[PDB]
Design a protein around this ligand. Structure first.
Ligand SMILES: Nc1ncnc2c1ncn2[C@@H]1O[C@H](COP(=O)(O)OP(=O)(O)OP(=O)(O)O)[C@@H](O)[C@H]1O
Ligand SMILES: Nc1ncnc2c1ncn2[C@@H]1O[C@H](COP(=O)(O)OP(=O)(O)OP(=O)(O)O)[C@@H](O)[C@H]1O
Ligand SMILES: [Mg+2]
Ligand SMILES: [Mg+2]
Ligand SMILES: [Zn+2]
Ligand SMILES: [Zn+2]
Lengths: 580, 607
């Protein structure tokens, strides 16, 4: 056995071969046959399968990845030469295990894990161009051009300092092109914010992809990366050989996974509470309990949380459809706008909170900065590709950021001209903006555009503009005071689980009754506007809201009740920003 | 002067034969059970309480204090010898280091006189860590008192963490494998840096003179979690005319990730030098941490507390030399006593003082910084930072339930403004230097001072017109006081008389109540912090009535007076702070009325 382990090459290979052949959900042989035609020599294996089949083999694999993976490679190559014994491949099959030890508490990582295979979920923050690293340096004498080679000189290259044919002094210089290189890509990946319990200091890790699996993860992608934990010394000065007693650590990736829920009890419970006739109203009430007397705004933000159903219009040639719901809460200071924004950001997973001011710690834009490598840094919008971007103080923004917001709300993507290349980062986010009117208070008789001073197009992109004000009503003040004092002297968890289940499983689809109701409502709106009239964008908003409401009810199909609720909510928002 | 073998015998006897009756008087060997758990790999760190040692051998404790590293090693060796005896189950070989150790032991036992070098280092037979807890007899030592004389002695200090580095793996026993002999080489490491070995010292290669070149391997080697932090003198112990001093602390093992910046902690550890030459070598010192723990009168005194004017008296004691500003002083006292946070409610009472130059604002801020137990003073850094790779708490973090007095507020950077806005909204500071949003707990009352731009305040110009601060930011503050230096011959004459008396006697003019000594004020403040008064539902009716009345008045007022729910929250906070001052667990009509009066007086000060 290899020193300091429990590993036998022959026995380990035989056990891996047995696992490949004798298994029940055989998938490995199926994908071996698939690789035959495809030619893709990378056999991905879920380590949990080995754990179930043989826990001892799984433990052995985790403990000594570097020494065990080659045995699996050899076994797979022998099998491929057994099944389909005749075939052509530039390099024999390779195995890249994954999903083995979800020690995703990156903040909780220990030196005991050094040189052990581990899988961690997170969002890649930055990358770099593939680095060619030498593996067989080639040298030629300045005097006599005596060619020589130095192979795998343990990272560094051993300069001969003396020739071998004229045996002159140190005159043999390296020839870069004649040498041999391998691909090594560096990635900086941040720990997934959701998994962190406290998240006081999000953790970051460095990954190296070697000889393959390069450029397979773009910046901002949320993936599960499985690789070997590594610790390497850092020299105090390159000239001297002294090394720090504290090692810097990184990961050598082995596999990338781009990315049921709970148990039967949770699905049963959510279905049961869905059966309630007033589940919509009850869910609205549960959302943001601190707030008071706001119902239409709460229902709108809830529908935004659920959002419309994802739809594929690639065949139709109409381009991507904005299934997300964008809501702008416009109100005077002290109407609890920021409280709602924070609460929504504190509830939805993978949500992002930002301020319209350029001083915001996050920033609503992405840009290239020197490391001194000019690498891209993502913005809040790109960061929350499928989450919810709660923008506060949305009124105060620069024209460039306004154009960026218009672009992202229109095409669901952000165009960045890095160097000379234009990159379209997909950002299908749900924008929840909050705006406070200019001046101390909101001047009535002035349109929201006049009193907020934002482009008409940009606000027309929003599918719901909710106007909230502090009425000069003594009764309202008394009620609010009673509510606050009572707060002085349904848990969010179940709501979050319900939203997650709705997003994961259900996908509302239109219905003939719903179609006719939509058409009738739109023509009625048109007729009303015959005497800010109706626009087809309003129809898109209505259909999206109806789909979201159906998702809330878990109907899986848009229903006339959903159409009625969507129309009523849209009319309420219209009234809120209406004037005449 | 003493036989360390005898010391090893004594420590083994102590560990074997120490028992303190646990829950329900259960006679249990407190350290025997821990030894069992260590033998089963169920524990990693074994903290030893020097009080227990003092239970039967004060001399041993004194020797440990006089020399700590030696006795730490002695205890570690004793535990290493004892562990096999207490082992009872062949626990699953956790990690790879356990199996590696098992293989090494099997090979060694598969062997006789042998050279001292040709044996495994003790530190390689490990994964049990030892630490000491300082005796109750030894009082905590101020950082300034820890000098070169105490180097090598176990000491307990108390301070505030100012920065902590990320956990990293530090090598303890480097392991190398030769190229020819197939043996193994080991290298204990104590220095922060080391020279990796090159040619193996193996007997086989030496005899065969093969010149086998060693290759370092991480799997064989042994690492330990490591963190470098800086602990600063807590403001209570700092001399009046000095500044806090800092001590570097090297946390390792299980002690890692047990402290955060701004934490008021107590550290027991060994004070040792690090040599990273006038009449001898010169070295920098540090503190090898062992235990880190995050910390949180006469009858006449009570009679004075019972006095109705008591509170007023305390107001008179807030910077007595500052003539006038009585209500401002009262508000400052309310800030000092803070809220209650009954559950949770933000208990910090943020106050801002906007005024023309030369109205004692800075002096007031300085006095508050001197009186508040935990205090920070700044002018506009304030927020945390990421130094180069370590978090460094700013003044706001250093407050951490204290009070941050920010003079010259109007000259603060916009980013700092946003930061303080976040501090007043969530009591947390979000900072990102490398695209990482780190959130730190900064829960601290804020006392800001600002000056109107372009000279003295112009009454004819509305707020934010004579000042260059966002209106919303001002509305965040619970109390906003405008101080105007209106020339009034009577009042000006009074002030002049006061100043002249001060200059002629180095003391303020005599008053009705003599100002109380700062220490007594602090004591009373803490006593008030003890209470957490409630708000009876009955009082709610009156509070709501008052709120609706004042809001109606604001609507009647042509100029908006920032009235909102924030105002009601502030009213409640002030009422509960006054209740704390009264030492009564139930608010009273009196307190509510007084809070309302203060709020009205602020808004009038904006007149
Ligand atoms: N209708 C309401 N129901 C419940 N609470 C309310 C209501 N209106 C205001 N509040 C309370 O008033 C305070 C408003 O604070 P917040 O900072 O969220 O206000 P905002 O209107 O978003 O402010 P701004 O626009 O100045 O940023 C919070 O305590 C909020 O709970
Ligand atoms: N109301 C007052 N009572 C007593 N002394 C006062 C008063 N107002 C100002 N002074 C005296 O004014 C002197 C100088 O002005 P001071 O230090 O108070 O300025 P300041 O208000 O802090 O100004 P700024 O914020 O513009 O720097 C101080 O020594 C202080 O004693
Ligand atoms: Mg707000
Ligand atoms: Mg001053
Ligand atoms: Zn030559
Ligand atoms: Zn050798």
């Amino acid at each position: 056995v290899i020193w300091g382990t429990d590993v036998n090459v022959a026995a380990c290979k035989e056990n891996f071969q047995r696992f490949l052949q004798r298994f029940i959900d055989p998938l490995y042989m199926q994908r071996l046959g698939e690789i035959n035609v495809i030619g893709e020599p990378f056999l991905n294996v879920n380590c949990e399968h080995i754990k179930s089949f043989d826990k001892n083999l799984y433990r052995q694999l985790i403990s000594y990845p570097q020494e065990v993976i080659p045995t699996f490679d050899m076994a797979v190559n022998e099998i491929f030469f057994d099944r389909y014994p005749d075939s052509i491949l530039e390099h024999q099959i390779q195995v890249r295990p994954f999903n083995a030890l979800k020690t995703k508490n990156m903040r909780n990582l220990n030196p005991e894990d050094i040189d052990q295979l581990i899988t961690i979920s997170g969002m890649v923050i930055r990358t770099s161009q593939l680095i060619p690293e030498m593996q067989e340096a080639f040298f030629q004498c300045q005097v006599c051009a005596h060619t020589t080679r130095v192979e795998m000189d343990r990272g560094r290259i051993a300069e001969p300092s003396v020739c071998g044919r004229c045996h002159t002094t140190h005159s043999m210089a390296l020839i870069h092109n004649r040498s041999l290189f391998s691909d090594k890509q560096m990635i900086k990946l941040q720990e997934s914010p959701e998994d962190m319990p406290a998240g006081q200091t999000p953790h970051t890790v460095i990954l190296f992809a070697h000889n393959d699996l390069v450029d397979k993860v773009q910046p901002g992608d949320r993936v599960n990366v499985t690789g070997i934990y590594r610790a390497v010394p850092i020299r105090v000065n390159p000239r001297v050989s002294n090394v720090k007693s504290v090692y810097k650590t990184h990961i050598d990736v082995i596999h990338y996974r781009k990315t049921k829920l709970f148990s039967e009890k949770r699905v049963e419970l959510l279905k049961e509470l869905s059966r309630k006739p007033d589940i919509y109203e009850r869910l609205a009430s549960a959302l943001a309990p601190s707030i008071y007397e706001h119902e239409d705004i709460k229902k709108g933000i809830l529908l935004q949380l659920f959002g419309g159903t994802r739809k594929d219009f690639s065949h139709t040639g109409r381009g991507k459809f904005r299934a997300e719901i964008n809501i702008l809460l416009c109100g005077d200071p002290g109407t609890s706008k920021s409280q709602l924004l924070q609460y929504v950001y504190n509830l939805v997973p993978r949500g992002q909170y930002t301020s319209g001011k350029g001083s915001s710690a996050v920033g609503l834009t992405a840009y290239v900065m020197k490391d001194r490598q000019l690498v891209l840094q993502t913005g809040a919008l790109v960061l929350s590709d499928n989450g919810i971007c709660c923008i506060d103080e949305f009124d105060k923004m620069n024209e460039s950021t306004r154009s960026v917001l218009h672009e992202v709300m229109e095409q669901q993507t952000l165009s960045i001209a890095k160097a000379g290349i234009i990159c379209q980062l997909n950002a299908r986010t749900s924008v929840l903006a909050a705006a406070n009117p200019i001046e101390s208070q909101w001047n009535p008789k002035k349109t929201t555009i006049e009193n907020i001073q934002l482009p008409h197009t940009l606000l027309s992109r929003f599918d719901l503009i909710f106007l909230m004000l502090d009425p000069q009503d003594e009764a309202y003040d008394r009620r609010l005071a009673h509510h606050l004092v009572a707060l002085y002297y349904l848990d969010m968890a179940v709501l979050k689980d319900y939203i997650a289940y709705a997003h994961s499983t259900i996908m509302p689809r239109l219905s003939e009754e719903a179609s006719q109701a939509l058409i009738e409502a739109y023509v009625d709106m048109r007729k009303i506007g015959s005497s800010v009239s109706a626009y087809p964008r309003q129809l898109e908003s209505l259909i999206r809201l109806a789909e979201a409401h159906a998702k809330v009810r878990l109907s899986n199909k848009v229903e006339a009740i959903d159409v009625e609720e969507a129309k009523r909510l849209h009319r309420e928002a219209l009234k809120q920003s209406a004037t005449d | 002067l003493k036989d360390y073998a005898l010391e090893k015998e004594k420590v083994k006897k102590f560990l074997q034969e120490f028992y303190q009756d646990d829950e329900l008087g259960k006679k249990q060997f407190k350290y025997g059970n821990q030894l069992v758990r260590l033998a089963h790999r169920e524990q990693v760190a074994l903290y030893v309480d020097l009080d227990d040692v003092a239970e039967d051998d004060p001399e041993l404790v004194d020797s440990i204090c006089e020399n700590a590293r030696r006795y730490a090693k002695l205890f570690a060796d004793a535990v290493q010898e004892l562990l096999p005896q207490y082992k009872e189950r062949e626990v699953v070989n956790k990690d790879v280091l356990d199996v590696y150790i098992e293989h090494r032991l099997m090979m060694e036992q598969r062997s006789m006189v042998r050279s001292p070098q040709n044996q495994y280092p003790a530190e390689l037979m490990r994964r049990f860590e030892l630490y000491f807890q300082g005796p109750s007899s030894n009082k905590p030592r101020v950082i300034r008192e820890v000098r070169a004389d105490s180097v090598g002695k176990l000491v307990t200090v108390r301070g505030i963490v100012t920065r902590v580095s990320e956990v990293k793996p530090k090598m303890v026993v480097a392991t190398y494998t030769c190229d020819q002999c197939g043996a193994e080489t080991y290298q204990p490491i104590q220095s922060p840096t080391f020279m990796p070995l090159i040619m193996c010292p193996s007997q086989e290669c030496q005899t065969n003179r093969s010149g086998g070149r060693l290759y370092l391997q991480t799997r064989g080697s042994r690492f330990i979690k490591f963190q470098e932090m800086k602990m600063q003198e807590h403001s209570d112990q700092v001399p009046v005319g000095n500044i806090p001093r800092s001590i570097t602390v090297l946390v390792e093992g299980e002690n890692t990730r047990i402290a955060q910046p701004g934490d008021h902690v107590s550290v027991t550890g060994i004070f040792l030098p690090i040599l990273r030459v006038v009449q001898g070598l010169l070295s920098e010192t540090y503190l090898e941490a062992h235990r880190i723990v995050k910390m949180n009168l006469t009858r006449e005194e009570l009679r004075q507390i019972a006095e109705e004017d008591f509170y007023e008296k305390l107001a008179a004691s807030i910077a007595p030399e500052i003539y006038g500003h009585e209500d401002v002083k009262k508000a400052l006292l309310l800030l000092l006593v803070g809220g209650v946070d009954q559950s949770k409610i933000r208990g910090n009472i943020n106050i801002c003082l906007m005024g023309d130059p030369g109205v004692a604002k800075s002096q007031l801020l300085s006095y508050i910084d001197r009186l508040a137990p935990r205090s920070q003073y700044t002018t506009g850094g304030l927020t945390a930072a990421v130094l180069r790779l370590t978090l460094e708490g700013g003044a706001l973090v250093l407050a951490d339930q204290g009070v941050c007095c920010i003079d010259e507020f109007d000259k603060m950077a916009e980013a700092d403004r946003t930061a303080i806005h976040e501090v007043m909204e969530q009591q947390t500071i979000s900072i990102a230097k490398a695209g990482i949003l780190t959130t730190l707990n900064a829960r601290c009352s804020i006392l800001a001072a600002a000056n109107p731009a372009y000279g003295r305040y112009n009454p004819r110009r509305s707020l934010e017109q004579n000042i260059q601060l966002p209106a919303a930011l001002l509305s965040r503050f619970d109390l906003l006081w405008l101080i105007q230096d209106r020339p009034d011959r009577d009042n000006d004459l009074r002030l002049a008389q006061h100043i002249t008396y001060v200059h002629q006697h180095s003391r303020q003019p005599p008053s009705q109540f003599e100002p109380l000594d700062m220490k007594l004020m602090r004591r009373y403040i803490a006593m008030c912090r003890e209470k957490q008064p409630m708000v009876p539902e009955s009082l709610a009716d009156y509070i709501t009535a008052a709120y609706v009345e004042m809001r109606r008045e604001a609507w009647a007022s042509k100029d908006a007076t920032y009235t909102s729910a924030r105002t009601l929250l502030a009213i409640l906070r002030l009422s509960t702070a006054l209740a704390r001052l009264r030492m009564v667990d139930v608010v009273e009509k009196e307190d509510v009325n007084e809070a309302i009066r203060l709020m009205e007086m602020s808004k009038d000060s904006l007149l």
